[PDB]
């Protein structure tokens, strides 16, 4: 029973010590707003924390932080006892004793500079036997007392004094190093860590569950992603925060020894893990271990692969161990390792997007401090092609510029140095600007896979097609019973056409943002490259990665690019069938219907498109996007002008009604050209931050009309051909 | 295990994982120890990585093993009783030297289980536990098509973990010791299987699916004239061989039927496979265009090789004119009507054994651009023309397509069928799908009646499409008279 336990859950707030509760929880423990919560761990220890009351952020979950995880030896999937302590205690005497384990490189008095201007207006409670970290000196040191006033009676108050003895105590191995990598050190990966969280804690946190049940436990997990995404970091964290022996083998040192003992080393590596149960085995790289694709040289390289296959094939129950492997791309792993019982679980981690990169800036900067005008939100927005390790490299090399630009005008060069200056290292905005403009990204030409910020308000007008996309995307994933009962299979994909520059890409991105689903962008040149080069297998990986990145939505921009490059309507003697779209068809037909992977096709010349892709089953839903009317052009202009500063006397209705045959891009280029004039005038006047009517009057003289009446009637003749309201279109049936 | 013989298993990686010099001795002693423990049996888990004498060709260390295996199975005289069993993944990875007589003469192929096969294996991996009364395995194995046998076992195991995770989260029975009186309450619900199956990753999804469909003769509305034709050419030579043999007339090798698109050419081929309790292979248009653009011409060899060994079976070549359409069609370039893929189909069709009950069905919609070389007597001589459905058969088509959907009693189908003149089979099915769209959307909107009324059909009929215009009509009458030719002496009473 005991209806007071709280299950440990993942924390989303990057705060110091705050616990979120529910409305009924205050009335059960009669606790006030700010109280002293007492927690019972094991081995007769207590912990103190600060509770926060909120009924908007969380509903019935706790937010337990890592500052008290190591102070109570409590991990994920464990129960705890909560108890209020309304007793009022004011500490007046405390004892401090540094341990001779991490005091290297630290000189002078560090308490008076790091602890005095940090605990004011904080009232943080402390207890004998707590490990807490501080942010100072471009690092983070720990503290642990061994003899002080009887617990508790410990409150940080200004009346306390300082003292020194000079006789450090020897540390013990009972506790672990809290500085090691944990679950709070990985950001920008919510969906990928969730799968690991829901497959690793079953056979490790509760080993006794699996000796009694006959359920097959997962034995091998394969990690993916470009180099530097953090495959090693995740494996190090999931083993350090679970309580299992982590054994790491890189792979080059396996193959660096003489031929004959590498196999013995690999065998003993697996053998030593079984006795140290629970245990875990992680392989840093696997492509250079089993390159049975194109290398095929020497039995020395095949003996290792055979030994690994033998070692993971014979992994019966016996003990509890999980073999984790990481690589860079699936096209470099021996398929013999992908069989069942060796590597059946494959997880892919992609490039973090703007909301993901900002989440990982903080981990690599929390050890230091910045200025008040320097914000990491904007610095991670315009970058798109940076891997996780690129951010860490950028921060490190920005710190060096900070100190270089600080000591040049000071010239504090002498015999010895003092520790009271390196705490003043503050990174400015220009430091990050120059450091980022100088950084060299690693991966920049991959299929970027991210969820855009674009919403339905970005697309002006087109209210008729918004509901159409909603009713074909959101419905089959929200009401499967209603679709299943009527006995009608959901639409596999939608292709919409129309004149260029009308929001076909924005429509596809909005339906991905609204569904909280992933998005893949395949442009025209991305599809022309695989045609000229006779590289036809490149379409296999697109669908393979889209399927595994579920949920997701495909996008095939300007599918008629091959037809345009081949001649179009007539061209040569050939018809309308090509090789790339042919390979798209056989992969589209082979997709599983249940999976929530949608395909969106975009084109502007449907007359030269392949009729074979129009058949019912692959792309049957067609949406025609006409030119915006006067009603929607005002919305398009005002949506495009939200970011730019626009004056109050700028009338948009007249401007929108003045343009008759103008598409969406024609209105955006007008705004860009108007911004050009304002920027140029502002620069010239330096030797007003607003856009007036004069800027638009001059910009409208350079207006372009890409869609002429030549492009107009090419679509009415197509719409009537596809609709065909003749014969019996509008007739009242007697029955 | 169920015969009473000593089972000896060798994987193959541990054979090649030891130092060079003792692996051959281990393999030899493995064969030698089986003879003394008679009766015995030898099974090799994988053989492609044991004898990769196709493209690897590196080192005598890898050829010594192959030679040792060949020596050990070549010298298997009577002496004792032992059977060497080997498994692999695909025939294109085995040394042909092992396929000789006396080493591996018996080849058996096991395909992907279909809906009736997968349901049969759900029960084995779930009998150890119990489910709820509303959870049924019949429907869960129906919509899946690309799952291997081990995929089902993996899916069940990972659904069980979700069951316990969703059960102990709200209970939190975490203490020092555990009791055995709770794990018997582990019941798997429907949403558990739904999320587990939607999250599973199938292994094989782009193979030639080889299965027997559920489709029957009642699914195809009308076309009573062509049903008997297919019966009399498929079921007869396999049922009365003596009657065919006595008259001295060889059975028809294959049948190609043509007609406008969307008229049941695929369903006709599938029904004749279901009725004969025979296997079925489906080769679509893109499946045939892929082997043409890529200059991969040997891919047609394996199709016929696996069709022959999967006897009884029926072939299907959908839209055979796809290569001609992609090449230009009637005129195109200066070339004629002969290509490479259909050329390789001809040499494989001529080489088939007549006795084997492997039928070939060809489907096309533009017979004017088809290769005349495939029309010759001997390969595809029987031609069936499938015209547009009449008023009599459109009612049957609509009522057959509407069996699954809930249809109200006041929905008249005869008027709807007689209202459409130039509508093919797919034109009637898209109307029903569009009518179901409106009912589903109205049902969802009204949430904030489970039936289809006349209003749903009235609105859906406004969006009706007529794919087959009169442009596509007379292109077939001119062909039918050319092939039939009742002129000169068509209808004349002979005195003798
Ligand atoms: N998502 C991430 N969050 C935080 N740090 C990351 C992330 N991805 C990469 N890093 C940084 O990259 C460094 C090394 O990359 P790592 O992942 O260890 O190698 P690999 O990418 O090959 O697994 C880590 O020490 C970590 O600081
Ligand atoms: N309806 C619209 N609402 C807002 N912006 C639009 C609209 N149509 C076009 N644009 C602008 O034109 C640009 C090009 O639109 P795009 O999505 O590329 O359409 P398409 O791909 O069909 O040409 C967009 O980046 C957007 O700024
Ligand atoms: N005679 C018919 N009876 C039932 N359904 C039909 C019929 N003709 C066409 N259909 C429907 O039209 C769709 C297309 O039929 P299909 O098998 O492709 O024939 P074809 O290949 O000649 O177009 C089928 O999925 C089927 O539901």
Author numbering:
A (entry chain E): 21 to 707, 728 to 775
B (entry chain F): 260 to 707, 728 to 775
Sentences from the paper on this structure:
The human AAA+ ATPase p97, also known as valosin-containing protein, a potential target for cancer therapeutics, plays a vital role in the clearing of misfolded proteins. p97 dysfunction is also known to play a crucial role in several neurodegenerative disorders, such as MultiSystem Proteinopathy 1 (MSP-1) and Familial Amyotrophic Lateral Sclerosis (ALS). pmcp97 is a member of the classic clade of AAA+ ATPases and is an essential cellular enzyme. p97 is composed of six protomers forming a homo-hexamer with an N-terminal domain (NTD) and two tandem ATPase domains D1 and D2 (1). p97 is an essential protein in regulating cellular homeostasis from membrane fusion, Endoplasmic Reticulum-Associated Degradation, Mitochondrial-Associated Degradation (MAD), Chromatin-Associated Degradation to NF-κB activation (2). Critical functions for p97 include the translocation and restructuring of proteins from large cellular structures such as organelle membranes and extraction of ubiquitinated client proteins to facilitate their degradation through the ubiquitin-proteasome system. Here, we present cryo-EM structural analyses of four disease mutants p97R155H, p97R191Q, p97A232E, p97D592N, as well as p97E470D, implicated in resistance to the drug CB-5083, a potent p97 inhibitor.
In the p97R191Q, p97R155H, and p97A232E mutants, the primary variation in conformational outcome as compared with p97WT is observed when the D1 and D2 domains are both occupied by ADP. In these mutants, the ADP-bound conformation of the D1 domain displays many of the structural signatures observed only upon ATPγS binding to p97WT, suggesting that these mutations shift the conformational equilibrium toward promoting ATP binding. This effect is most readily visible in p97R191Q, with p97R155H and p97A232E displaying similar effects in the D1 domain, but of a smaller magnitude. Residue A232 is located at the interface between two p97 protomers, and the introduction of the glutamate at this position will result in steric repulsion separating the putative hydrogen bonding residues T127 and T436 of the N and D1 domains of the adjacent monomer, respectively. This disruption likely accounts for the increased flexibility of the N-domain and also results in a shift similar to that of p97R191Q in the loop region between K425 and L445 of the D1 domain adjacent to the E232 residue. Of note, a T127A mutation has been reported in an individual with FTD, further suggesting the importance of this hydrogen-bonding interaction for the function of p97. Our results demonstrate that the effects of the N-D1 mutations are mediated chiefly through the destabilization of the N domain in the ADP-bound state, either through a loss of interdomain interactions in p97R155H and p97R191Q or through inter-protomer steric effects in p97A232E.
